[PDB]
């Protein structure tokens, strides 16, 4: 029942979500956030001038990365505050992190070359990591990560989460939580396991663990899905999806009509996860 559902790009991946989904996302490159700013060109130049004035009231150097892109180098190790623009369509991103130097400038430079704009409804055919209104073009390895939070107007109290992060996790999902869940199940008769095992989606080898419980007049859920990931892989990073309904204060309206409804939403979203074909 995917009427009106929208395919979204996050990082290297696509996922389908219902049309009324409320979505929040963060993106991280070599461990630091890359943040969309709505600055126009003169507003960006004014922002940079203000920051330089303030750092003088500590400051070291202003660096041209080329493409109307610039970074400010100060003391925090340095602090490199990079402002980078997408092409062809103008959008500004801030990318700020600590630096112990020539290597970081080169990374900022490559970012300024590689950052491409994308239209709102566009799924790029070129390789790259999608962020807000843009994508970092290429398919050479880089440390990259995102997280997406999602709420659903028709399911109060429900939250869904989708994340990728390069590098293998040190354990798998079933290894990580099975003892914990078993202790829960033997403590609380309202607690059950709905499903435990594997949930592949195409080539993505997801482990899956779905629990639910009833108490205080409410029914809560914690659904978990994880690809452990491989080292230095863009397309099989650590990858997770989760859906939770936790305690809400007063008896509040159910998040779902039944476990089956909850499981159908879950499966429909999870089965839509795939590497973006490029």
């Amino acid at each position: 029942d995917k009427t009106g559902w929208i395919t979204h790009c996050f990082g290297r991946f696509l996922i389908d979500l219902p049309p009324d989904a409320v979505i929040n996302a963060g993106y991280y490159l070599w461990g630091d956030r890359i943040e969309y700013l709505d600055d126009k060109p003169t507003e960006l130049a004014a922002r940079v001038d203000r920051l330089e004035q303030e750092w003088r009231t500590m400051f070291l150097r202003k660096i041209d990365f080329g493409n109307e892109s610039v970074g400010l180098l100060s003391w925090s190790t340095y602090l490199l505050d990079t402002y980078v623009t997408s092409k062809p369509t103008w959008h500004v991103y801030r990318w700020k992190g600590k630096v112990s130097e020539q290597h970081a400038v080169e990374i900022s430079r490559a970012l300024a070359r590689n950052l491409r704009s994308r239209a709102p409804k566009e799924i790029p055919s070129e390789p790259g990591f999608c962020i807000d209104h843009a994508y970092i073009a290429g398919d050479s390895f880089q440390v990259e990560r995102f997280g997406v939070g999602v709420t659903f107007p028709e399911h109060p109290g429900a939250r869904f989460e989708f994340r990728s992060s390069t590098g293998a996790e040190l354990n798998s999902l079933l290894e990580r939580v099975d003892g914990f869940v078993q202790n829960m199940l033997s403590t609380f008769a309202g607690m059950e396991t709905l499903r435990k095992g594997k949930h592949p989606v195409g080539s993505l080898p997801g482990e899956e663990y779905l629990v639910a419980g009833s108490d205080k007049g409410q029914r809560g859920y914690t659904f978990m899905w994880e690809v452990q990931g491989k080292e230095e892989s863009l397309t099989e990073p650590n990858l997770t999806a989760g859906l939770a309904v936790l305690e809400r204060s007063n008896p509040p309206p159910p998040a779902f009509k039944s476990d089956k409804e909850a499981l159908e939403l879950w499966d429909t979203i999870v089965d839509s996860i795939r590497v973006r074909p490029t």
């Binding site: 461990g31 994340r163 996790e169 939580v177 829960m184 309202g190 607690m191 419980g213 409410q218 305690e247």
Partner: peptide, 25 residues
């Protein structure tokens, strides 16, 4: 408490070591 356990599972216990460091930044 049942919902406290569910909450512990969601906020911390199912998050792997790498994902915990990332969430805490």
């Amino acid at each position: 408490d049942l919902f406290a356990s569910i909450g512990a599972l969601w906020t911390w216990a199912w998050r792997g070591p790498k994902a915990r460091q990332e969430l805490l930044k």
